[PDB]
Design a binder for this molecule. Structure first.
Ligand SMILES: O=C(NCc1ccc(OC(F)(F)F)c(F)c1)[C@H]1CN(c2nc3nc(C4CC4)ncc3s2)CCN1S(=O)(=O)c1ccc(C(F)(F)F)cc1
Length: 553
């Protein structure tokens, strides 16, 4: 079936959409080439519609069936609980889109009677009706990028699809505990979301080291969400139903699958019918868990089809990276084409065709590659980095305009051991927070679908917990990583690393003068900036840390 059909009514904005970086004093000190930075608007939604609209052909085989049987057997060991309305209300993110039935997220979290009893009515309707498609809103997403003269051109807006707030709370009732617990049982060490960056780089490196003769590849599915078929979503459902579930959870999971997850009508911000979806919606509770299960099932079956030896999968939503034993040069190239043919029959055709790699640092996965530095002892330490272009473009944008979501903060947390997050992002934003006197103010950040409220003053213990103490002493980064950063700063008109070192010495001194947590920030986050280093010891609060958040679905 077609992933989408369209009526021709437009995907419309609801807020005023800005596309260009504005004139700013603080922003210009980050990057000068402001004209290289753009934000996607609804005006490019038509171009995205074309990319994501296509017929899916899907043919399944015994390898696919065998893998599924094994997954269902694991899933049969999981017991999940049905949350009450009130419990699911408390798990709703603070800034979630308001209901069209006259209450918003703040009312849901407060357990407002109008909100609670509406959700009860939505639940009752899911129990009685397993068929009628549930309405969804389609919106163009506004995201910031930098122009790439080498790439094809400017990226079109992504499209998001989400049901009403009351339906979103019912999803948590039925499925929050399942999406929380089932994937790690079914997929074990292949399940990507159980890992911090320290733990994911450790798993990738040790998986690579464990092979007699390693080969790996990333596999990039073209428009993964659109390749997910109604059958895939029902197969997903059949996995979930293997859990030990309350009878009302079983019924609501069936209804949510048939009425929402497999597809339904799309409504724009003006309330016009835009069309119909028969693939994955980006804004439902099961999208990360379902995409990870589906990608793992297809990949695992395809590994058996291609006869890859000892193939270790690492799956994070639609992100797939596979590390296996090489069968030799020619045999690996052939086997990866057969892997790709099997993924294609399963309706997961590649964007870029995959290629075997024999150096772990050459694989890109979760937009990131493994790189090497040295800790305070001189020991080799592996960590994940990425091209800093997009983080820096978005950082420039968030400096100039007020944004509800702070990509700079999520990038500091996920890329803390990197040369660029330490030298530029930490120095630049701590300088801003000091001058605004906002060091204590909690900020929202979103990381791969989970939302957190983070005070910048707690970054040292958060980084230690996610990365280890070495994240504050890394030095002697690789020439290729230094060159990539240096080159990106010249391209964007960002001051060179030597300028940041000087700005960081000043930020660091001013933090130390404040004592308390600010001084701990100056001591740990900026020990790299000073000639004579302080002795950095494990932070006490790094053990006792609430690293939990909310799903934004
Ligand atoms: O995405 C994550 N881990 C995977 C990952 C991805 C890219 C990586 O590489 C890169 F980018 F680092 F290079 C990398 F290494 C590691 C994030 C988010 N999480 C999530 N748990 C989920 N669980 C689900 C379940 C429903 C299916 N869905 C979605 C999410 S998102 C929990 C685990 N992490 S995390 O341990 O890194 C983290 C915990 C707490 C904070 C805090 F400090 F903010 F609190 C900040 C980060």
């Amino acid at each position: 079936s077609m992933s989408y059909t369209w009526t021709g009514a437009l995907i419309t904005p609801c807020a005023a959409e800005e596309s260009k970086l504005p004139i700013n004093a603080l922003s210009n000190s980050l990057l000068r080439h402001h004209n290289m930075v753009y934000a996607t608007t609804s005006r490019s939604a038509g171009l995205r519609q074309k990319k994501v609209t296509f017929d899916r052909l899907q043919v399944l085989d015994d390898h696919y069936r065998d893998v599924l049987k094994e997954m269902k057997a694991k899933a049969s060991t999981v017991k999940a609980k049905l949350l009450s309305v009130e419990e699911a209300c408390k798990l709703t993110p603070p800034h979630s889109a308001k209901s069209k039935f006259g209450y918003g997220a703040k009312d849901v979290r407060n357990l407002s009677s109008k909100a609670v009893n509406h959700i009860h009515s939505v639940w009752k309707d899911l129990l009685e009706d397993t068929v009628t498609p549930i309405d969804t809103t389609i919106m163009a997403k506004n995201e910031v990028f930098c122009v790439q003269p080498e790439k094809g051109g400017r990226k079109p807006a992504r499209l998001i699809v989400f049901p009403d707030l009351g339906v979103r709370v019912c999803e948590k009732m039925a499925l929050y505990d399942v999406v929380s617990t089932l994937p790690q049982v079914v997929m074990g060490s292949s399940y990507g979301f159980q890992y911090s960056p320290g733990q994911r780089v450790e798993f990738l490196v040790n998986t690579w080291k464990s092979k007699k003769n390693p080969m790996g590849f990333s596999y990039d599915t073209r428009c993964f969400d659109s390749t997910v078929t109604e059958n895939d979503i029902r197969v997903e459902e059949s996995i979930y139903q293997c859990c030990d579930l309350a009878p009302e959870a079983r019924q609501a999971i069936k209804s949510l699958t048939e009425r929402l997850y497999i597809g339904g009508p799309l409504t724009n911000s003006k309330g016009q019918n835009c069309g119909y979806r028969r693939c994955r919606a980006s804004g439902v509770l099961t999208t990360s868990c379902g995409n990870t299960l589906t990608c793992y099932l297809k990949a695992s079956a395809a590994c058996r089809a291609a006869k890859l030896q000892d193939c270790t999968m690492l799956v994070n939503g639609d992100d797939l990276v596979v590390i296996c034993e090489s069968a030799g040069t020619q045999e690996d190239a052939a086997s990866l084409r057969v892997f790709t043919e099997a993924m294609t029959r399963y309706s997961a055709p590649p964007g870029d065709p995959p290629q075997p790699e024999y150096d772990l640092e050459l694989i890109t996965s979760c937009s990131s590659n493994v790189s090497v530095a040295h800790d305070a002892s001189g020991k080799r330490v592996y960590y994940l980095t990425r091209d800093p272009t997009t983080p820096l473009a978005r950082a420039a944008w968030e400096t100039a305009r007020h944004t509800p979501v702070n990509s700079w903060l999520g990038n500091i947390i996920m890329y803390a051991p990197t040369l660029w997050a330490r030298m530029i992002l930490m120095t630049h934003f701590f300088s801003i927070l000091l001058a605004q006197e906002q060091l204590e103010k909690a900020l929202d950040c979103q990381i791969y679908g989970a939302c957190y409220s983070i005070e910048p003053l707690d970054l040292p213990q958060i980084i230690e917990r996610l990365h280890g103490l070495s994240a504050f002493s890394l030095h002697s980064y690789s020439p290729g990583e230094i060159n990539r950063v240096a080159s990106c700063l010249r391209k964007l008109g960002v001051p060179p690393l030597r300028v940041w070192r000087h700005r960081a010495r000043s930020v660091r001194a001013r933090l130390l003068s404040q004592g308390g947590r600010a001084a701990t920030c100056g001591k740990y986050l900026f020990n790299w900036a000073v000639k004579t280093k302080l002795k950095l010891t494990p932070i006490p609060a790094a053990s006792q840390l609430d690293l939990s958040g909310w799903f934004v679905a």
